Design a protein around this ligand. Structure first.
Ligand SMILES: *[C@@H]1O[C@H](CO)[C@@H](O[C@@H]2O[C@H](CO)[C@@H](O[C@@H]3O[C@H](CO)[C@@H](O)[C@H](O)[C@H]3NC(C)=O)[C@H](O)[C@H]2NC(C)=O)[C@H](O)[C@H]1NC(C)=O
Ligand SMILES: *[C@@H]1O[C@H](CO)[C@@H](O)[C@H](O)[C@H]1NC(C)=O
Ligand SMILES: *[C@@H]1O[C@H](CO)[C@@H](O)[C@H](O)[C@H]1NC(C)=O
Lengths: 412, 444, 48
């Protein structure tokens, strides 16, 4: 259970719901916190479970990384007639049972939450409160979104949502569109940067770089350990959290003797005496950078959401209108000759009352063909189908000719 | 040179009313180093926007198939000699020793990811040997390979070669656009997309050599067939799937049987092997090599290999939805031009070079057209005096013509002089041609 | 390769109504169609 050694203070509790301060004030290996243990269930919250040593939303709030929204949580008991549940109603969530509250990261980049009236619980879609007699509600709040946070100083005041073909994602009106509007529920990754709002992304290209800052080290201690805190006989072998701020930095002063692994000894000063705590290096801690607009940036929080997106399928699939008549067709005793102005003609065919005649030649502005059947003698209308080199030119034309004299044709 | 009358739009005074010109254009691509020209005609002494398609080069790029990695490796052996009936020194266990099973003596190695093997050799048994028992003793040997140099080489093969054309898109009001594309392929550039037909030949056969790449150092050619199964005494006897596996001698690498030579002489064991140094073979066959008139060489930007062979292709690239217009171009500009010289040949793929001295007061172009409209000259005009050059085609030993040159203003005459050299073909029947010809070797 | 193309004297082209392709080749056929139970008569045709 190394994941219960939380970075920073590790305060996984929300204001008002302070009846679980025994185990939700700094989360340790011992107790159970309702607002944290849900994140560690298998199959749920996989993005956080991968980045399990980064702060949660509540932890980021308590470290002043993420602010709290105006009406931090407008209670449904006292503010059910106010336009509160607007960003929540556009998300498709799934709460378990016996939960009286649920927190999320609103559009402005702050933390808001929905709290049901006393003795009520949030339904399976977290949209309504229902009352069950003789039910024991949990003392925490359910994390609605799958996200992880961190401390960043990179500025993002110029960052904005840039999604192609999206009229509106979530509660953000990207642009104004008219006509067809494909509306659906989609999983959109999003990020929050310093001095910015929520930024939805089309792609999630993120990388992590390691460091030797205090948040990257997991420092623990044993219970019943000699010359340590809780130095009394134990009936069970359990661990205890340790504050790395006490172990001295290399070439510096400190208050406790402290030993660790290779990374800790490289960063901090490992003692040669009996140590008070063991400081290992975290699985994957570090700094996570997200690729936005082709440039890397340092986000405050990174997560994904299930929100209603309105797309535009198309304005026009394809337009195929070509009434082109840029050619001159004239019947000649030598042969049926058509000069195509501009576009060249390679092969062509001429039909006249069933019987057709073909012709092949190199691409040229004109082409001559033998007359089809007795159309030369009888005149009439003859259809021509030819293959042009260009496009947007009608391939079906009609030529009207009077009866011709074969004597000039065969004259010799 | 080519109009857009069927899709032309009103490109009001001053402001621009372009209507997203959708009509496609079907024009023949120029030869290597030549340009393709477009005409966007609006109001006389105004507009006249020119879109140019420069043909940078035509290369016969490679389409790689299978590949692997290799490097330099050396073995290290640990030996432990035990008398009979000690540990697993039973003879039945001694001869039937599996190569992938580790002895108990070398347990400090434990679990490792390095390539390794284990052998057991019978030795003498007796008080002279060192053991009271007279049955043969055992010597257990554990050998692992380690990389000598911190570099790797990638060996691959070219199943086929593909024609590949590089174009420079001199767009309207700005020529910052260079693209590369193959046969029957389109690229979604600005103002729509550009497609290439290249209907002559989409392929140029295959080969039976192998190619080596050293990252950050270049390429090379080796004259052996690309074998997917390792072979002793050849290249790629020990092959991996990544540079890290090569540099770490990871166990996932494949190798041929019986590479390690064992010398179990009674004093100390000698573990050694003779391996083809891939770096030596790489240095032996650096790319600029000609084999049966092919002359493989490094592509520009060192992103692959080429194949210079005798041949030519016909390229007919197509534009579509080309729309790039602004409003500030409504103003007119004047310039002055002066003929400089004429060089080159006639009826040749190389063509004739015309250089012009343009003395202009600002940004602009040039639209000199001959009397019959067959030959067109386009050159940008800039502030002050500049010397630009252009490529055209001719069919006469001597050139003496007049062109109607006017840069969005008054029409003026420009007179061009000069002769052209004669290319000796050493064999001529009718003519040479003007198509797009790929680079060829001398021996071809 | 739009349809009006000739390959080794075949000249494939679009059938009338654009429901398929044709193949114009040299040749001829003998057709002997047969009617059966042909009965289509009325009474008003008795007048001249
Ligand atoms: C031998 O007599 C035939 C019968 O008159 C002529 O063949 C056709 O005659 C039609 C009228 O009798 C013409 O119809 C006209 O066709 C044009 C387009 O072709 C239409 O615009 C007209 O509306 C239509 N009707 C009229 C009253 O004009 C046919 O065009 C015509 N067929 C042709 C000319 O090929 C023969 O012309 C005639 N031959 C000789 C040598 O005298
Ligand atoms: C003798 O000792 C070895 C230990 O080196 C042991 O493996 C072997 O089984 C023994 N042989 C006997 C007990 O016969
Ligand atoms: C590799 O070793 C394991 C255990 O030593 C054995 O089960 C397996 O058969 C070996 N593979 C071979 C002999 O190909």
């Amino acid at each position: 259970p190394h994941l219960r050694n939380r970075p920073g203070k590790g305060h996984n509790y929300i204001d008002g719901m302070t009846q679980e301060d025994a185990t939700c004030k700094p989360v340790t290996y011992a107790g159970a916190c309702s607002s944290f243990d849900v994140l560690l269930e298998k199959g749920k919250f996989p993005l956080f479970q991968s980045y399990a040593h980064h702060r949660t939303l509540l932890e980021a709030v308590h470290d002043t990384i993420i602010a709290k929204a105006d009406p931090p949580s407008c209670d449904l008991q006292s503010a059910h007639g106010n336009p509160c549940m607007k960003e929540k109603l556009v998300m498709k969530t799934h709460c378990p049972n016996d939960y009286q509250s649920a927190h999320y990261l609103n559009n402005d980049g702050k933390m808001a939450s929905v709290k049901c009236p006393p003795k009520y619980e949030l339904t399976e879609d977290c949209n309504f409160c229902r009352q069950m007699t003789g039910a024991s509600l949990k003392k925490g709040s359910y994390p609605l979104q799958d996200l992880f946070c961190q401390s960043s100083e990179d500025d993002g005041s110029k960052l904005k949502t840039k999604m192609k073909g999206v009229c509106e994602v979530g509660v953000q009106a990207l642009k104004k569109c008219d006509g067809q509007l494909s509306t659906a529920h989609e999983v959109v990754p999003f990020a929050v940067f310093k001095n910015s709002k929520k930024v939805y992304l089309d792609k999630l290209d993120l990388k992590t770089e390691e460091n030797l800052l205090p948040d990257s080290f997991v420092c623990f201690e044993h219970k019943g350990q000699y010359k340590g805190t809780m130095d009394s006989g134990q009936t069970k072998r359990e661990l205890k959290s340790f504050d790395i701020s006490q172990c001295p930095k290399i070439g510096g002063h400190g208050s406790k003797k402290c030993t660790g692994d290779a990374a800790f000894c490289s960063a901090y000063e490992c003692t040669a005496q009996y140590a008070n705590a063991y400081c290992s290096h975290a699985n994957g801690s570090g700094i996570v950078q997200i690729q936005v607009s082709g440039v890397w940036k340092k986000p405050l929080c990174v997560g994904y959401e299930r929100v209603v997106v309105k797309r535009e399928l198309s304005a026009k699939p394809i337009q195929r209108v070509e009434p082109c008549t840029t050619c001159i067709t004239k019947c000649e005793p030598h042969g049926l000759v058509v000069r195509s102005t501009g576009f060249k003609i390679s092969s062509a065919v001429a039909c006249a009352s069933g019987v057709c005649v073909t012709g092949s030649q190199s691409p040229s502005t004109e082409i001559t063909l033998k007359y089809p059947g007795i159309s030369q003698s009888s005149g009439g209308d003859i259809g021509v189908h030819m293959a042009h080199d260009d496009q947007s030119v009608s391939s079906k034309i009609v030529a009207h000719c009077p009866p011709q004299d074969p004597c000039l044709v065969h004259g010799c | 040179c080519s109009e857009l009358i069927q899709a032309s739009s009103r490109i009001t005074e001053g402001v621009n009313t372009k209507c997203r010109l959708s009509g496609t254009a079907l024009i023949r691509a120029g030869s290597v180093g030549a340009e393709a020209c477009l005409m966007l005609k609006g109001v006389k002494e105004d507009q006249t926007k020119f879109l140019k398609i420069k043909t940078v080069s035509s290369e016969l790029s490679c389409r790689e198939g299978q590949s692997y990695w290799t490097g330099s490796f050396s073995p290290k052996c640990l030996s432990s000699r035990r008398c009979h009936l000690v540990g697993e020194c039973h003879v039945n266990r001694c001869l039937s020793w599996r190569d992938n099973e580790t002895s108990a003596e070398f347990s400090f190695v434990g679990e490792s990811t390095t390539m390794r093997e284990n052998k057991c050799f019978e030795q003498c048994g007796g008080w002279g040997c060192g053991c009271f028992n007279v049955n043969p003793s055992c010597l257990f040997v554990h050998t692992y390979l380690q990389s000598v140099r911190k570099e790797a080489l990638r060996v691959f093969n070219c199943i086929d070669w593909v024609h590949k054309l590089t174009l420079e898109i001199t767009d309207f009001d700005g020529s910052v656009s260079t693209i590369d594309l193959g046969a029957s392929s389109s690229r979604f550039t600005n103002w729509g997309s550009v497609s290439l037909s290249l209907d002559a030949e989409g392929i140029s056969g295959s080969n039976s050599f192998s190619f080596i790449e050293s990252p950050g150092k270049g390429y090379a050619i080796v004259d052996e067939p690309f074998s997917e199964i390792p072979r002793q005494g050849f290249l790629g006897e020990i092959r991996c799937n990544s540079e890290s596996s090569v540099l770490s001698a990871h166990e996932s690498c494949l190798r041929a049987p019986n590479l390690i030579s064992y010398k179990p002489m009674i004093d100390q064991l000698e573990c050694t092997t003779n391996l083809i140094d891939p770096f030596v073979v790489f240095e032996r066959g650096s790319l600029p090599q000609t084999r049966n008139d092919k002359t493989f060489a490094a592509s520009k930007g060192n992103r692959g290999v080429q194949a210079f062979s005798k041949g030519s292709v016909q390229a007919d690239l197509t534009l579509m939805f080309d729309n790039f217009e602004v409003d500030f171009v409504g103003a007119a500009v004047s310039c002055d031009a002066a003929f400089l010289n004429l060089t080159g040949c006639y009826s040749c793929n190389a063509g004739a070079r015309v250089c012009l001295s343009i003395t202009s007061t600002g940004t602009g172009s040039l639209s000199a057209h001959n009397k019959d409209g067959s030959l067109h000259i386009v050159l940008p005009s800039e502030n002050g005096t500049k010397d630009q050059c252009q490529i055209l085609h001719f069919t006469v030993p001597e050139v003496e013509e007049e062109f109607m040159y006017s840069c969005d203003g008054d029409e003026r005459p420009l007179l061009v002089k000069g002769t052209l050299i004669a290319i000796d073909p050493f064999d001529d029947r009718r003519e040479a041609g003007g198509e797009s010809t790929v680079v060829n070797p001398k021996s071809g």
